[PDB]
């Protein structure tokens, strides 16, 4: 019988040791206590799964790159293991995404009140992200379904953030960042990606007086990331 | 006969080529046209002399360090050239400071109106800085005079900024940064240095609504530098 | 039924994806085919387990550091999970070491001929290393046994390398590097560590004519690492 | 009246302070004592002028780059100062080269004996280099003359090094490095550049037994630089 405070302590310890699989597992155990998460427990869960899926996405990109070159090389003798190793990483990546998506759908989005608007946007942004990670590796009909699922999660998150959060709020800014990345990289819609990132940046600078003493550093950091992407995409 | 716009273009060209002596010389020529400087011409002058004096201060520190070791080494045969080379760098550093101080006293502070409060604080901060650079290399009675001169320039700048600028203004924040460094490093007053940097940071976060769309990045950068120094000095 | 060439391909693919656990597992499967390893398969096995044990050693150091501070902090409420998390990492580290040590004792050292002197030194250096990693985390009577085991493996490796390899050979140089680290860090014998590293470096420069066209870069790299450690330990 | 040992001490002090103009001036004063240079005084002179000309070459490249863009921009109002500032840097660069070339022709190459083969190759490599720096900024008939002058200096250096130095000697390796760069960048002869760098590298690995205890690190460093350039040029 392990206490909730000890599990959060375990996640913090795993983060310092860079053992993100342990970190994700501890925060998954906290979620499964079937109680709402604090703002702190929410970010610990987010950081854990971002680093776990990040390592899988990086590995998949490396092996897929080698796979495209091996097929072009003409050596049929080597293609078998490259494809199988890419598939192995791909299934691991998908299982990480499905693991987070089950947590969001059966616990986090399912049981946060209609009043906890910050929590709702935070979880729907995560949902958009993990369906986007699934979209990156998916093909054909499987791809179209997860793309729609990602779009649906980002749009709902966007509507609640627009209505209940200031344009400078790091959750609203972070959402605009990832949703515009989804338009650019997944939907291949550079105009809509640039518009979304421009609107978010301009709405934040127009309401710069709404910057909070506890999160102004996070706000200015994401505003810069939005401007960075806007520069990259428009050049 | 060289135009003012061409001299500012020369300073910008010298900055890109990292030829700061050329940059300082071009901005010194602009000042000597005996007209007020634009906000742009002011920062170009400031950046030029900061890089020129910065290179001299770095060289003086290196040779002074070797000088202290050579005297401790007991080799009297080598002390002569080290001391003379340190003295050579030292005179160059002092002549750079006197060059900037003459520009401020006979042009910049001398001819900006009682209404141009931003200009006044900007020039008195520069004056405090260049007397502080002189204090670093000076000894005895010579040191006490330049320390007083630095203190007098920073205090006047502090009074005008407190009265006519928002606590988040980068000129007011930058002034608090350097004036607290003067207390810590020159006056060896850690308490007064920490108090000055704390007050400035706290006044800025208390009036975070006064952040300007054109300079919020500069404000948040100096606020962080203040917090950095406060952490270093209190640990 | 997976081919030996495909398993080596899997290890190379895992190395590019930085999935060292996969890499170690593939090379463990190659070893278990119960045939000698090529020079290439040997280094792939060595690199795999070095990165696997390296991550465990780094994690153990981080959590042990936090453990020493938490005990000193006086918060008895937090000591329980830190100790248990350190113990968890520690058991993982020990199981990695025992896994490699079983491979060396039941396959690699057990079945390489009396003639394959390069192979013998290579495997006995690995044995010295993995017992040294065990010594780092062990205490009391358990520590003394693994220290002796490490010493015994390094000494045998040292005798065969002295007799059958040139002083510039990267395996002989690499052995002198790790064996001197064992004296310094494990045995706390700075004199014997410095002597071993000095002798190896001096023997290599005295026979610089024995440098091989295929490994001169590896030789000069380890010679520098020996000189680096010698500088650090003698200052 | 300043002693030769004090001037070399001044050059070493200037090098630590990164005051390369002072360093070059001190070594120019040593050369002008009209006596041969030691191996140490030779490298101090070489390092001084390399850093002085290096800063001019870097500045010229930056301003020439801006000049090509300003002419393409169509703003005739700005072209005047860019061209004049480039010309100013260019004359400084040329005067540095002529300063070194006068030292080599009226002192160093002029008065080293027919027996000091290391000194002869060292000075003729420098001569090839400084005429190459002149070739980089020169155009038309002026360019053809300095290109021939560079070629003539490198070829003579190449003949003496081939006859009196081992293929692993850092002076012979360094010569092959710069002479092949001259073929690639100045003469636009990629085949001849690759052949020269390949021959030098292959001659060095074929005589790896000729590596000296006092300069093996310099030899292996330049051998790698040759292999680096060979990779870049053949891909």
Swiss-Prot record, chains A, B, C, D:
Cysteine pairings via disulfide bonds: none
Chief localisation class: cytoplasm
Phosphotyrosine modifications at: 133
Site (Interaction with phosphoserine on interacting protein): 57, 132
UniProt KW Electron transport keyword: no
GO molecular function: identical protein binding; insulin-like growth factor receptor binding; phosphorylation-dependent protein binding; protein domain specific binding; protein kinase C binding; protein kinase C inhibitor activity; protein sequestering activity; receptor tyrosine kinase binding
Pfam families: 14-3-3 (PF00244)
Chain positions with Phosphothreonine modification: 145, 234
Region (Interaction with SPATA18/MIEAP), start-end ranges: 2-235
Modified residues (Phosphoserine): 71, 215, 235
GO terms for cellular component: cytoplasm; cytosol; extracellular exosome; focal adhesion; membrane; mitochondrial matrix; nucleus; presynapse
Record: disease: Developmental and epileptic encephalopathy 56: A form of epileptic encephalopathy, a heterogeneous group of severe early-onset epilepsies characterized by refractory seizures, neurodevelopmental impairment, and poor prognosis. Development is normal prior to seizure onset, after which cognitive and motor delays become apparent. DEE56 is an autosomal dominant condition.
Protein name per the record: 14-3-3 protein gamma
């Amino acid at each position: 019988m392990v206490d909730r405070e000890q599990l959060v302590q375990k996640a913090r310890l795993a983060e310092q040791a860079e053992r993100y699989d342990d970190m994700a597992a501890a925060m998954k155990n906290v979620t499964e206590l079937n109680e709402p998460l604090s703002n702190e427990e929410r970010n610990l869960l987010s950081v854990a799964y971002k680093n776990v899926v990040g390592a899988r996405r990086s590995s998949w990109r490396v092996i897929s790159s080698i796979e495209q070159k091996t097929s072009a090389d003409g050596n049929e003798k080597k293609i078998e293991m490259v494809r199988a190793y890419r598939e192995k990483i791909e299934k691991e990546l998908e299982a990480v995404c499905q693991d987070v998506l089950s947590l969001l759908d059966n616990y986090l989005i399912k049981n946060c009140s209609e009043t906890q608007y910050e929590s709702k946007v935070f979880y729907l942004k995560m949902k958009g992200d993990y369906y986007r990670y699934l979209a990156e590796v998916a093909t054909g009909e499987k791809r179209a379904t997860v793309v729609e699922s990602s779009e649906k999660a980002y749009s709902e998150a966007h509507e609640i953030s627009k209505e209940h959060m200031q344009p400078t709020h790091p959750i609203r800014l972070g959402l605009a960042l990832n949703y515009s990345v989804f338009y650019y990289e997944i939907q291949n819609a550079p105009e809509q990606a640039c518009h979304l990132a421009k609107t978010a940046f301009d709405d934040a600078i127009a309401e710069l007086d709404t910057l909070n003493e506890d999160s102004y550093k996070d706000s200015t950091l994401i505003m810069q990331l939005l401007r960075d992407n806007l520069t990259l995409w428009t050049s």
